[PDB]
């Protein structure tokens with residue numbers, strides 16, 4: 001490997017290379033139009049081929065970062081369009097690439113990407129599949145310049161498959177529009193997981209990330225020995241640390257080294273890696289990162305002997321505290337793939353707190369004898385919440401569950417924006433649909449994973465437009481204490497009922513012509529404003545108003561002169577409601 005471009009061209013293949021080069025340029029030159037990028041990509045790609053033919057051909061022995069930066073420095077308009085970015089070109093290499101990284105604009109001033117109609121889309125897809133897809137890949141790459149390029153490429157190919165299938169189905173939109181929604185939401189979620197892992201690492205440090213990773217790796221690979229699990233956690237932590245810094249190639253090399261290491265030591269890690277490890281380099285690490293938990297060994301004893309009963313608990317602990325705590329987490333974790341990672345972490349902190357206390361007390365052995373009892377309420381807490389909220393979802397269906405949640409959280413934090421209360425409640429309810437379909441034992445991991453993105457989105461919005469101290473508390477706590485801080489929120493008894501607005505509770509006959517989605521949203525917005533206006537209102541009372549409201553909408557979406565019914569019956573609904581409440 002005298003030629004890093006040649007070697008990359010050979011590993012990836014022409015198609016993948018072209019796409020990844022496009023994404024890379026799109027992420028740095030975020031205001032250059034599609035056609036400049038296509039020219040760059042073809043220039044780099046002709047050049048690549050030259051080095052494949054002959055690794056000694058001129059400039060082929062240069063560094064990927066060298067060639068990338070030289071090409072950025074060739075763009076004629078660099079100073080006029082990107083100002084400071086052009087000053088990077090004056091640097092010699094190690095710092096030039098670090099300079100360009102710094103001048104990527106996260107969330108730049110760009111107008112929202114409007115979804116064309118299905119038949120406009122499918123026609124452009126048929127008419128010129130290549131430019132349709134790549135022009136859209138360019139549009140996403142340039143608005144998400146830190147999005148890991150191959151994860152973005154993985155998404156692109158699922159769009160290609162979605163268009164391929166649904167554009168030749170005789171009912172185009174009912175096929176395609178759902179798949180575009182799932183992709184849009186997986187995209188925003190995966191993006192938000194990235195941004196969350198990197199802020200947690202910054203705030204709380206390496207130890208806390210390594211704790212989290214021990215728990216997760218141990219659930220995944222319950223047959224690995226501890227020393228193999230800690231080797232992995234150390235390499236994971238180096239990988240995550242380098243990928244947060246956001247340099248594409250340094251992240252991609254670290255991720256490949258780890259995937260390579262895992263695929264070579266498969267029989268010391270998990271038996272479910274065969275297929276991932278037969279895939280090409282581009283896809284290996286991604287496949288492994290999503291692999292199912294291995295089945296745990298049958299012969300697994302109690303943790304009591306090593307962690308509670310053994311004399312030498314304090315001595316083994318004091319000799320390497322984190323190592324001992326990590327062993328405890330490893331042994332607990334691999335027996336419980338049914339626990340959320342953060343429940344495992346509460347348990348480990350409990351074990352830690354008790355050892356710190358007990359190993360300095362008169363009789364340590366007696367002191368930590370019953371440490372396992374302290375785990376019981378922590379375990380039961382999220383289990384019981386899932387029991388209760390999934391029972392509710394079983395009774396109500398998704399929509400009516402979402403409305404239960406609206407009432408619940410509007411009352412707890414009625415200063416929150418109505419649009420925000422509505423979105424997070426809809427979203428919480430979808431977490432019910434997804435997670436309450438699992439058997440009891442998969443439910444906690446499902447909840448943890450989807451709640452972490454609903455609650456980050458929550459805390460992101462609130463950082464920007466603060467509203468409640470209590471919410472800021474829950475948002476700035478450890479990721480281990482986030483969800484339970486939110487669960488501990490109580491009804492705000494300080495809230496002054498908001499003033500009646502007539503317009504707020506006036507409806508027009510165009511609600512009959514909205515989608516199911518749009519109707520629901522306008523009703524749920526009404527429900528929030530209802531609770532915001534009458535916060536002491538009882539569930540029985542609330543029900544009585546929603547039944548009449550529901551009755552009202554039906555009647556006037558059935559009437560000759562729809563709009564008169566809305567103004568006239570509405571006068572009767574509003575006055576009836578104001579009486580009863």
Ligand SMILES: CCCCCCCCCCCCCCCC(=O)O
Nearest residue numbers: 020021044067068252255256282285
């Ligand atoms: C002339 C410079 C052009 C830019 C070169 C683009 C580099 C793309 C390489 C990305 C490596 C992708 C391999 C996947 C690694 C992984 O996630 O496991």
Ligand SMILES: CCCCCCCCCCCCCCCC(=O)O
Nearest residue numbers: 208210211230322323325326348349
């Ligand atoms: C392979 C060993 C890695 C190190 C393992 C350390 C285990 C620590 C257990 C306590 C978990 C606490 C999670 C973060 C909370 C805090 O920062 O106090």
Ligand SMILES: CCCCCCCCCCCCCCCC(=O)O
Nearest residue numbers: 409413416420458461462471486487
């Ligand atoms: C911008 C600020 C937004 C704040 C929105 C507050 C609404 C509360 C959301 C908390 C729900 C999280 C799940 C907790 C489950 C439970 O109730 O036990």
